[PDB]
Amino acid sequence: YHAYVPKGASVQMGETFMPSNIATAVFRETEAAAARADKTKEETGFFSQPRLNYPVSSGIPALFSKDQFDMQYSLFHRDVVETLNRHTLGTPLEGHNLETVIRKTSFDATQAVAHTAASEHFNYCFFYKSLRPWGTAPPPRLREALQLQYGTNGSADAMDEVRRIVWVTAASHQERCGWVYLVWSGVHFDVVEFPHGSCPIASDLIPLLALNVHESAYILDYGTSGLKQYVENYFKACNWPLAERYYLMAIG
C-alpha cells in the first residue's frame, strides 16, 4: 500500500473517530496530492534531495523541533536544488557529478548561480549526514589525532577545545549566512568558516563535520540571540565516527 499513500500522510489504525465531513476532506486532499505528484514527477531534474538516514517525523533529538528541521529540508534546501537544476541544464555541466559541477564552476563570476547552488546542495547534504540523532561519543583514534594538535596537557582536552573553537568560529562569522566545518587540510586539522555559496571541496579540503550557521537554521527554536546554545546542543547531536572514518581514509 506504501506506493498509494501520499508523501506526507502516515498509515495507521482506524480508531473510528472520523466524522464523515473530515473523512471526505481527507479524500479531497489526497486527490490534490495525486495531481501535484503528477506534476512533480515531470518537474524532476538531474539532482535531488538526499534521503535521510534517520526518521525526522519528530524533531532531531536535543537539537531541532519538527518545524525547524523541516523548514531547512523542505524549504531552503529544496529551493537550492530547484535552482541548481534550472541552471545545470542547457549548459556544458549537464549530467555530471555533484563534484564536477562544484569544481568546474569554482571561482567564476559568470557561473556563480550554478556554483552557489551546487555548494549549498553539498553543504546541506553533508550537514544532514553530520547529525546523528542521539549523538555519539568521539572514537579513540580521532581523539588521539585531535589531542596531538589542540590538546594542552589535559584528558581529551581536544574535545572541549574543538567544541570551543567551533563555537568561537561560529560567533566570529557575523553575516549569519554560511557554514562552519571541522576539516582536514591534509597536513593538519582546522575549523574553517565558509561563507554562503562556498564549499570545502571547492577549496580542496576534506570535510569532517558540518555545522549550519544560517540564521534560518536556529531562528524558530533558539531565536536570534541563541547561537551559543544552538552550537552547544549541536554537539549533543553531532556524528563523530563519521568524521573519524573520513579522517582515517584521508590519511590512508
Partner: protein, 48 residues
C-alpha cells in the same frame, strides 16, 4: 545516549565496585542490577 553518558561518568573505575556502592546494604540485590547492567551495556537492551 544514556549508554555513553554512563560510560563517561563511570569513567575508569570498576563496574562491580560501582554496583556495591550504588546499593547500600538494604537497597537491592547486586546480582540483579549487575545482570541488567551487563545486558544493557553490551548486548544492547532496554534497561530494566
Amino acid at each position: 545516549a544514556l549508554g555513553r553518558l554512563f560510560s563517561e561518568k563511570l569513567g575508569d573505575r570498576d563496574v562491580h565496585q560501582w554496583a556495591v556502592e550504588s546499593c547500600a546494604d538494604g537497597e537491592a540485590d547486586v546480582r540483579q542490577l549487575l545482570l541488567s547492567l551487563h545486558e544493557w551495556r553490551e548486548r544492547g537492551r532496554p534497561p530494566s
